[PDB]
Amino acid sequence: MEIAYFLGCIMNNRYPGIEKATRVLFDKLGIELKDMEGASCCPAPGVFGSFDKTTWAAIAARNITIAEDMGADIMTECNGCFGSLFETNHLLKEDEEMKAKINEILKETGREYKGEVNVRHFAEVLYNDVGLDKLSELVEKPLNLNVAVHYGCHFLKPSDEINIDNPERPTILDEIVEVTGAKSVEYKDKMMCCGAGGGVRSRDLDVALDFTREKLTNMKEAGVDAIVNVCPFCHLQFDVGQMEIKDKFGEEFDIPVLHLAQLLGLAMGLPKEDLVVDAHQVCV
Amino acid sequence: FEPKIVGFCCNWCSYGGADTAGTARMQYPPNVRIIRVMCSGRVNASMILKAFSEGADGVFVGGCHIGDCHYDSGNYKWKRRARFIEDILPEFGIDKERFRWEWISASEGEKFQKTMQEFYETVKYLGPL
Amino acid sequence: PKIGVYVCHCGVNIGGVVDVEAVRDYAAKLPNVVIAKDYKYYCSDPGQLEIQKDIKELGINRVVVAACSPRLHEPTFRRCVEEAGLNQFLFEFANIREHDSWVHMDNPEGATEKAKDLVRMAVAKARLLEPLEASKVSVDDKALVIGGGVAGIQAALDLADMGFKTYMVEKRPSISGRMGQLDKTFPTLDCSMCILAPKMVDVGKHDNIELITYAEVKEVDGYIGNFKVKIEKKPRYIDEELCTGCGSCVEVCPIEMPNYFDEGIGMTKAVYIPFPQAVPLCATIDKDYCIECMLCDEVCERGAVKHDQEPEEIEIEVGTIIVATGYDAYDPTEKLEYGYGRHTNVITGLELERMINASGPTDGKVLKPSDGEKPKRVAFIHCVGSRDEQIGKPYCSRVCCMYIMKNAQLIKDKMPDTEVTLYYMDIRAFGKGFEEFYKRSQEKYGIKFIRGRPAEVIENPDLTLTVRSEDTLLGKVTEYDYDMVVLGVGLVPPEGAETLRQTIGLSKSADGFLMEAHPKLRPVDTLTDGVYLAGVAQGPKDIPDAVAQASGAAARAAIPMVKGEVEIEPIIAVTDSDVCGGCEVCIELCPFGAISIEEGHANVNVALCKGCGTCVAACPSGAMDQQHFKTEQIMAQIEAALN
Amino acid sequence: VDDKALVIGGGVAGIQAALDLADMGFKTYMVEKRPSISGRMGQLDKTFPTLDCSMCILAPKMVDVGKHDNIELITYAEVKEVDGYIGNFKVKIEKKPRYIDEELCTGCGSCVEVCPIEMPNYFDEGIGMTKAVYIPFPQAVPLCATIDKDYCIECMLCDEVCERGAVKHDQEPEEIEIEVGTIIVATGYDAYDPTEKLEYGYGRHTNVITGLELERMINASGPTDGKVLKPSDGEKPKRVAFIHCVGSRDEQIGKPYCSRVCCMYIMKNAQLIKDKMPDTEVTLYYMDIRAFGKGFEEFYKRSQEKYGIKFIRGRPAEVIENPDLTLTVRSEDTLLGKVTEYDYDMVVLGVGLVPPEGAETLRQTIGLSKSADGFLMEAHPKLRPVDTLTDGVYLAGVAQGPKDIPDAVAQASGAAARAAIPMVKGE
Amino acid sequence: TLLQREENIIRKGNIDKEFSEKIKAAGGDSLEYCFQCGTCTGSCPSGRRTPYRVRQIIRKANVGLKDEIISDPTLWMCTTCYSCQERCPRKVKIVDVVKLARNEAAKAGFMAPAHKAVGSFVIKTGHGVPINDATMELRKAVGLGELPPTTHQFPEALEEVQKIIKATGFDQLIGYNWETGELE
Ligand SMILES: Cc1cc2nc3c(=O)[nH]c(=O)nc-3n(C[C@H](O)[C@H](O)[C@H](O)COP(=O)(O)OP(=O)(O)OC[C@H]3O[C@@H](n4cnc5c(N)ncnc54)[C@H](O)[C@@H]3O)c2cc1C
Ligand SMILES: Cc1cc2nc3c(=O)[nH]c(=O)nc-3n(C[C@H](O)[C@H](O)[C@H](O)COP(=O)(O)OP(=O)(O)OC[C@H]3O[C@@H](n4cnc5c(N)ncnc54)[C@H](O)[C@@H]3O)c2cc1C
Ligand code: SF4
Numbered sequence A: 001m002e003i004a005y006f007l008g009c010i011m012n013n014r015y016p017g018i019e020k021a022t023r024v025l026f027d028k029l030g031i032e033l034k035d036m037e038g039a040s041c042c043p044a045p046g047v048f049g050s051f052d053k054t055t056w057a058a059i060a061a062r063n064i065t066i067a068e069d070m071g072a073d074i075m076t077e078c079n080g081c082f083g084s085l086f087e088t089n090h091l092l093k094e095d096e097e098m099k100a101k102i103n104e105i106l107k108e109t110g111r112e113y114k115g116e117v118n119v120r121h122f123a124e125v126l127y128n129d130v131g132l133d134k135l136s137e138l139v140e141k142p143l144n145l146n147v148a149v150h151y152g153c154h155f156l157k158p159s160d161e162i163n164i165d166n167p168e169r170p171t172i173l174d175e176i177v178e179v180t181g182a183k184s185v186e187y188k189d190k191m192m193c194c195g196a197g198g199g200v201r202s203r204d205l206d207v208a209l210d211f212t213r214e215k216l217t218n219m220k221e222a223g224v225d226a227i228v229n230v231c232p233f234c235h236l237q238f239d240v241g242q243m244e245i246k247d248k249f250g251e252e253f254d255i256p257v258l259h260l261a262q263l264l265g266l267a268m269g270l271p272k273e274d275l276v277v278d279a280h281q282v283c284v
Numbered sequence B: 001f002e003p004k005i006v007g008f009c010c011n012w013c014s015y016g017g018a019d020t021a022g023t024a025r026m027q028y029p030p031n032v033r034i035i036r037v038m039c040s041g042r043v044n045a046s047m048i049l050k051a052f053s054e055g056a057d058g059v060f061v062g063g064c065h066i067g068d069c070h071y072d073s074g075n076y077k078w079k080r081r082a083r084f085i086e087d088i089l090p091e092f093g094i095d096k097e098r099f100r101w102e103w104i105s106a107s108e109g110e111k112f113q114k115t116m117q118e119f120y121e122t123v124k125y126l127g128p129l
Numbered sequence C: 001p002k003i004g005v006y007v008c009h010c011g012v013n014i015g016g017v018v019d020v021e022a023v024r025d026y027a028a029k030l031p032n033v034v035i036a037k038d039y040k041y042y043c044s045d046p047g048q049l050e051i052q053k054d055i056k057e058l059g060i061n062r063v064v065v066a067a068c069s070p071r072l073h074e075p076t077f078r079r080c081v082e083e084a085g086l087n088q089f090l091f092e093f094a095n096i097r098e099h100d101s102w103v104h105m106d107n108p109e110g111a112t113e114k115a116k117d118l119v120r121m122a123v124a125k126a127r128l129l130e131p132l133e134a135s136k137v138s139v140d141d142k143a144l145v146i147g148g149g150v151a152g153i154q155a156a157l158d159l160a161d162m163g164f165k166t167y168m169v170e171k172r173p174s175i176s177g178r179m180g181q182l183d184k185t186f187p188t189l190d191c192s193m194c195i196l197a198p199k200m201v202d203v204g205k206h207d208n209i210e211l212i213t214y215a216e217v218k219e220v221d222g223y224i225g226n227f228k229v230k231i232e233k234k235p236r237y238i239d240e241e242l243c244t245g246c247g248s249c250v251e252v253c254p255i256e257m258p259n260y261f262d263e264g265i266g267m268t269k270a271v272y273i274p275f276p277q278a279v280p281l282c283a284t285i286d287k288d289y290c291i292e293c294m295l296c297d298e299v300c301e302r303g304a305v306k307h308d309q310e311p312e313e314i315e316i317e318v319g320t321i322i323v324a325t326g327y328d329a330y331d332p333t334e335k336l337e338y339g340y341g342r343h344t345n346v347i348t349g350l351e352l353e354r355m356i357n358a359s360g361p362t363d364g365k366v367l368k369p370s371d372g373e374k375p376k377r378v379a380f381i382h383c384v385g386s387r388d389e390q391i392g393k394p395y396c397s398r399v400c401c402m403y404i405m406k407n408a409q410l411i412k413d414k415m416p417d418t419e420v421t422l423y424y425m426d427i428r429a430f431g432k433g434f435e436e437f438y439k440r441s442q443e444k445y446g447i448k449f450i451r452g453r454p455a456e457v458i459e460n461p462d463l464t465l466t467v468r469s470e471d472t473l474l475g476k477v478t479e480y481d482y483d484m485v486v487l488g489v490g491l492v493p494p495e496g497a498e499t500l501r502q503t504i505g506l507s508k509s510a511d512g513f514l515m516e517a518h519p520k521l522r523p524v525d526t527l528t529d530g531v532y533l534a535g536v537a538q539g540p541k542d543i544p545d546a547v548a549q550a551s552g553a554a555a556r557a558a559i560p561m562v563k564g565e566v567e568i569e570p571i572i573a574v575t576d577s578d579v580c581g582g583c584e585v586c587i588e589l590c591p592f593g594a595i596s597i598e599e600g601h602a603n604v605n606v607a608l609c610k611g612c613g614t615c616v617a618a619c620p621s622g623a624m625d626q627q628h629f630k631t632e633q634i635m636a637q638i639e640a641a642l643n
Numbered sequence D: 001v002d003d004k005a006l007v008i009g010g011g012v013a014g015i016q017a018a019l020d021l022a023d024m025g026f027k028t029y030m031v032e033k034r035p036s037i038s039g040r041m042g043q044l045d046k047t048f049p050t051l052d053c054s055m056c057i058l059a060p061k062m063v064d065v066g067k068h069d070n071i072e073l074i075t076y077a078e079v080k081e082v083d084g085y086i087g088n089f090k091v092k093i094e095k096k097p098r099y100i101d102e103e104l105c106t107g108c109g110s111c112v113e114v115c116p117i118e119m120p121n122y123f124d125e126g127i128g129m130t131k132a133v134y135i136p137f138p139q140a141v142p143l144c145a146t147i148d149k150d151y152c153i154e155c156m157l158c159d160e161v162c163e164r165g166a167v168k169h170d171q172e173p174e175e176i177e178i179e180v181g182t183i184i185v186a187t188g189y190d191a192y193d194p195t196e197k198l199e200y201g202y203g204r205h206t207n208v209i210t211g212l213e214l215e216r217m218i219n220a221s222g223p224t225d226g227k228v229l230k231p232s233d234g235e236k237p238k239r240v241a242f243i244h245c246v247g248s249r250d251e252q253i254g255k256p257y258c259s260r261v262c263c264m265y266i267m268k269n270a271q272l273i274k275d276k277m278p279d280t281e282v283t284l285y286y287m288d289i290r291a292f293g294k295g296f297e298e299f300y301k302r303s304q305e306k307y308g309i310k311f312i313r314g315r316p317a318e319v320i321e322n323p324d325l326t327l328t329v330r331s332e333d334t335l336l337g338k339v340t341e342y343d344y345d346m347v348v349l350g351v352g353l354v355p356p357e358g359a360e361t362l363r364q365t366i367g368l369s370k371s372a373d374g375f376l377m378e379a380h381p382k383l384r385p386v387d388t389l390t391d392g393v394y395l396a397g398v399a400q401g402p403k404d405i406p407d408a409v410a411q412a413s414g415a416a417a418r419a420a421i422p423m424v425k426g427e
Numbered sequence E: 001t002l003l004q005r006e007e008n009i010i011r012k013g014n015i016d017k018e019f020s021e022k023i024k025a026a027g028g029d030s031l032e033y034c035f036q037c038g039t040c041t042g043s044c045p046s047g048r049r050t051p052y053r054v055r056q057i058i059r060k061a062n063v064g065l066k067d068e069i070i071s072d073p074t075l076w077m078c079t080t081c082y083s084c085q086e087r088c089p090r091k092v093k094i095v096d097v098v099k100l101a102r103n104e105a106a107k108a109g110f111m112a113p114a115h116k117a118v119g120s121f122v123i124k125t126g127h128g129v130p131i132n133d134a135t136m137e138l139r140k141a142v143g144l145g146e147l148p149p150t151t152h153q154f155p156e157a158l159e160e161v162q163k164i165i166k167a168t169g170f171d172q173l174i175g176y177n178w179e180t181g182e183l184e
């Protein structure tokens, strides 16, 4: 199997360990990751979708046309990038005049959007294409960890279009986490936003940090050992906002932040160097 | 060019659909002429061929939705007859786009209006037979 | 053929678009027409008098009316002609209002030409019409009532008091329906059982009522006055004729199973009596839980225990049917954000009704499911399972507001110190005394109303519940703690509704309930003749509305049974034996098997034939022909439509 | 027990009850105070939630009543005395003088065309005119003319133009005595008069109308030929406001009950205005939207989604007439939490339902008790909705309380059954 | 003084019907059919720590209070978490309405400096979060290239992105100055 590999911005520019773990895991699983040469920001929905819909859609359409020229479906392991690309794909597929406008914009770049590929999430690919049995067969050593799973808002919502899992009480990420031996611990307001989406992190950092602080308080009384996410935008929010909260209000949350790929690599016995925990501001 | 169109509609759903379109005041071209039958199963190829031979430029048949026939299964028989009629008509220079058959429920006035308008446009574009 | 043509102005509904002078003038000049007249309102009494006078004077033997759709007024003009001596089937209808005038307003000239063509087609058909005598069939003076709730009980008692022998089929072991489960009723707060039990006893004692409980209707065949009904009586494993309802078998039984009457919060034995006021007061054994220990067999003194009982098949012949199957309560398990079935102290309105009743499982004490202790804070949530497109329930359940307020008032009455809060979108206190009841909920009992549809219910570690909801009138989010949360679940069609609907052959409305013949003027009739609706079977409503509907259904079903005869339409196939070759390609095309072969010729049974015309269309040689829809008539109409 | 019944009121409820009783084989009298039967249903243009034509479905029933062998129709008459008991009621009725012979009049209308005196038409609810001799509406049953002597000048032109000799200026009131076994009261309702709501300015502001007046105006056969026009200048309003709960749920006027139908017909009339005039802006001021009946919530959603009718949750504080005769509604938007002063070309008051004129006299004549809301009281609020504690007397329709057409029809059929039971038993 | 003659009353002067029609035509059609139940606001996580009220935004959009919406800071408190849209009993596309209102606000000049900085980063490098030296060395240590195969590595891809930005008008919206490569 071959699938186009979209990196985004945060994973490849602040936390390359997630990218390394994903590459190693997908090489082990027998899936070829094809690089989307010349890809750019998806662009992050929070700012670009809020400022100008046409520009956001055009940039996302160019990103999609890269994968269309390679023949493959796009795989992304970021909730924000998945949301942006997936939303642009269904809009253009089910909207001919918008498609014509986007193609008129794209003509100057020597590209044309054809609506020929699908946008897929890393977790969804792991759950469906691979299955839990194959993932279990690859676990070299079970983990002894209590983890708080952060689904992120844009993994499963809007659920009418995505149709991956129930957005109120999902279980997909919990199952993928638990095949590793880690225990997915329930905590209050588990499905709450991290506060980074919609451009809020850069508009009002205090509000986003309040989101993150409420989530961290709930996770801490749940008595968890780590946070598992499938969004580099949530990953960065948690990791950097823990220290920001430490400096601002002095509250000391010392919960490591791990991407699902990093947790799978830990359960698969990958080298400690490949996880690149040095990029994390919260020590793992 | 104003095409001549003849319509056959079952008493229970398609005729009811036309009545619903009328009550809602849904306008459509006046070329069609509706003939009432109790069931679409009453319609056979002889009526369609007679209509085309007498000067009709289009023939419409309306029936209950499959599974909704008042008389249980007449519309199935009509559907078979209609497929055979579409087979037969082109052999004598009559385009099968001049013969339309649809399932219209008694409450589907808007669908009936759209069907009438689109069929009129098609038949007019085809021109005189 | 002397054809008289009557073009209706309908005020300005045809006249305004179509020239009822130019159209009458053409009709007078068309071959075989001996009169052409126009009247403002022909369906009215003066118009029918004009038609009758014309028939009597000019000797018209064919009547053509250019008026609205035949589906509206064909029977009207048919009985008009007869009172003036003509046969009913000599009359023709031209549709120039729904088909011509209301759909071609922007083309008056095209509208008039279409009206001329349609009247020409109508006269062409009328030329070849012939008299057909319609056959009368007797109407059985018996009624079946399906469902033993308040509506069904009312319908059965009304029919039996009017003298008709009535059957009442009830799937539960006892009658009462949902009204027997209620403690009190709004807006009066009177005891529901105290007023329902006498009616149940009346049903159980009536000479004209045959009560068949623990039974279901399996098959329905036939038509109005002539319904054949196959009913399946499930085995009680208790002899109804012998059992006295003492309850010793219940006392000795070792097995415990849920009591359906208590709605999942009450227990009884494998042998049980649903409630003390059951009618018939008889025991029932649920074999899913019976271990065949024979203790009930040994303790019974009447010898009423029958562990070898079998299901029984009953066949009845009735003239009318009244469906009164009621409803089920919405199951809010799918509303995950409210946590029903997951949070311990979240209950439904019907469960609260069972819990507040003195005869309920808790002896009338409102107690928390978690600890057996009275809640100090209670929240009610309105519109659960209703007015929600996220679950495909876009309708109002019409009673949840009032019974929510009633149960809040009852909780305040029993436990005055309790705090009660209601979360509502609209307060629909529309009925008689309902607005006063709504005001009394605040003035007298001090119930708190928050206009806000709750976003979430969160269970805290101590098992209390935080309702997170906006107060839209304060315009602010609130998170309030409560010891108990009650979901105001709506009403849905009962389990097995589709099976019975298909068995009878009825249609359903958009909300899933059974559809009435006309929303405004025939609320209790259906389009199936001889079948009527009563109560929540037709849609959610309160007890007085259901009782009124039951009485109306009784009247409507009594009308034809008093008449004793119905007319059969004669639009049936007829075989020309001299032309028929006995090819038999027509028999299988009749879904009712009306066609057989006698003496090598096709023969149609009038009773079985319904008049679809499929066989006639199938016959190549034309031996088969439908009355009133002959091939020559339709061919003439086709010819006139284009010439 | 006598096998004859008396139905008082010729509305949809009374028509249904009389037809049901007649079809069951009982000889029935119908008494109607107006010259023709139909009630308020005959005045409506369409009906919610289907927007079907009211008259198109009511007229066949009126004709059936008028030509039934088991029904004796006595219009323009009033019940004067009721004596006796169940099965043994002696009823004295007075047929008011039409001054037109019912047996001779064909309702051609020539006398109307020739009459020189203009007078208000009761069927048009104070916004339509007719002559001193009039037929209330074309579908009237009986189709017969009536002369109102409060306006007649005795010019005799009607006598000259009448070919049937049906004009009778010397007619006198007639006394009728009937013996019946059961009585069904179906006297309906009157629309609440909002003149006393001084802040809304009905009767003072030119462009303030009621819902029933709007029904007559929008009716294609109404005084304006179905056109919604400003009373001030006869032009179409570009902005229309609707006010809910006028005369209802208001303790300041002693009306603490819900009228149960004003929400639905307000939404229906807004939809009809939008259908006729798609460019009109329609706003509704409501407290609760009571869309409880079958298909009513969907009707409300359709009002918002398909027609773009605006809903403001707020009971208006005042209606102010501007110098140019436009109307400013001053009301809080409680969901915005702010006071709004919006301008409109027409304001329609969603008036409620009250017992009809002369209700107390008939109630005392029969001897019935009334409920707290002022309507007639039933024997049991739950299990006997159409019975009264007086044996042999039954209630049907809005006589028992506000409700819509299907509820009244069901009540009428149930009352027919309940009255038939004693007559079937015979003792 | 508490006196304020304009902020405490709504008249036709505060209403812009063209704004409502524009939002509805651009994909906010559903806001026409809000019944103001308040489920959205109760579900909103930013609603209980900021003055942001989503239901009131929907109501103002329906009414046509353009100035009250586009100039509102709280409009930017929505994280687009979609909870309200998931729970709306009328199926209103709440997030689409919020984004259309934000687009109008940006066109009106209500843009945060940090959002403009993100846009300028995308213009300059093609990435909302461009790479830094520390991440470059981290990548080289783990065998990833020094630069990811994005607009960082391929100048022609950056040129295509900048052409898209120029064609869509984004440069003008954020006030990006090509000559000096700054914001004005
Ligand atoms: C919690 C709650 C509180 C309420 N409180 C009040 C109140 O205070 N006042 C009030 O006026 N109304 C109240 N109502 C409404 C009231 O319950 C209904 O209006 C009334 O029960 C309807 O009666 P019914 O006979 O139409 O239906 P039901 O009461 O449901 O009776 C239907 C009967 O049909 C039977 N049946 C179903 N299917 C079949 C079948 N296939 N074959 C045979 N029999 C069948 C059922 O078992 C049952 O015996 C309340 C409702 C609820 C849910
Ligand atoms: C503006 C408006 C719009 C409405 N729209 C709808 C709608 O769209 N759909 C719907 O279902 N319902 C609608 N309704 C409600 C509907 O009008 C009533 O449900 C219905 O008219 C009740 O019929 P009724 O026969 O009980 O009473 P009425 O219609 O009032 O008829 C009563 C009859 O009794 C007569 N009468 C009165 N007193 C006496 C007396 N002393 N002696 C003899 N006769 C007497 C009256 O003159 C009249 O003929 C609407 C109501 C209003 C006000
Ligand atoms: S016959 Fe039909 S068209 Fe003529 S007045 Fe009656 S309803 Fe109207």
Ligand code: SF4
Binding pocket: C238, C242, C243, C244, C245, C246, C247, C248, C249, C250, C282, C283, C296, C299, C300, C301, C302, C303, C304, C305
């Ligand atoms: S089965 Fe026997 S012991 Fe049991 S209730 Fe009936 S009579 Fe009593």
Ligand code: SF4
Binding pocket: C249, C252, C253, C254, C255, C269, C270, C271, C285, C289, C290, C291, C292, C293, C294, C295, C296, C297
């Ligand atoms: S035989 Fe069955 S019902 Fe009887 S006592 Fe034993 S378990 Fe109970």
Ligand code: SF4
Binding pocket: C382, C383, C384, C386, C387, C395, C396, C397, C398, C399, C400, C401, C402, C426, C427, C428, C488, C490, D292
């Ligand atoms: S009656 Fe009240 S609680 Fe029940 S569905 Fe209607 S609005 Fe909701």
Ligand code: SF4
Binding pocket: C575, C579, C580, C581, C582, C583, C584, C585, C586, C587, C601, C602, C618, C619, C620, C621, C622, C623, C624
């Ligand atoms: S199809 Fe015609 S010829 Fe053949 S058996 Fe039937 S009636 Fe006779």
Ligand code: SF4
Binding pocket: C572, C573, C589, C590, C591, C592, C593, C594, C595, C604, C608, C609, C610, C611, C612, C613, C614, C615, C616
């Ligand atoms: S007309 Fe229809 S029902 Fe009648 S015999 Fe033929 S196929 Fe049967």
Ligand code: SF4
Binding pocket: D100, D104, D105, D106, D107, D108, D109, D110, D111, D112, D144, D145, D161, D162, D163, D164, D165, D166, D167
């Ligand atoms: S009174 Fe004479 S003129 Fe007047 S409507 Fe009657 S018949 Fe015609």
Ligand code: SF4
Binding pocket: D111, D114, D115, D116, D117, D131, D132, D133, D147, D151, D152, D153, D154, D155, D156, D157, D158, D159
């Ligand atoms: S006599 Fe009276 S009713 Fe007749 S025309 Fe003169 S004023 Fe009119």
Ligand code: SF4
Binding pocket: C430, D244, D245, D246, D248, D249, D257, D258, D259, D260, D261, D262, D263, D264, D288, D289, D290, D350, D352
């Ligand atoms: S039905 Fe609606 S408008 Fe009429 S009184 Fe009740 S709440 Fe007010």
Ligand code: SF4
Binding pocket: E033, E034, E035, E036, E037, E038, E039, E040, E041, E055, E058, E084, E087, E088, E089, E090, E091, E092, E094
């Ligand atoms: S949940 Fe939907 S209907 Fe309710 S206030 Fe929010 S947008 Fe409006």
Ligand code: SF4
Binding pocket: E040, E043, E044, E045, E046, E047, E054, E077, E078, E079, E080, E081, E082, E083, E084, E085, E094, E095
């Ligand atoms: S999408 Fe915006 S308005 Fe909706 S819940 Fe999330 S933050 Fe609140």
Ligand code: FES
Binding pocket: B010, B011, B012, B013, B014, B038, B039, B040, B041, B063, B064, B069, B070, B071, B072, B073, B074, B075
């Ligand atoms: S009745 Fe319409 S298809 Fe059979």
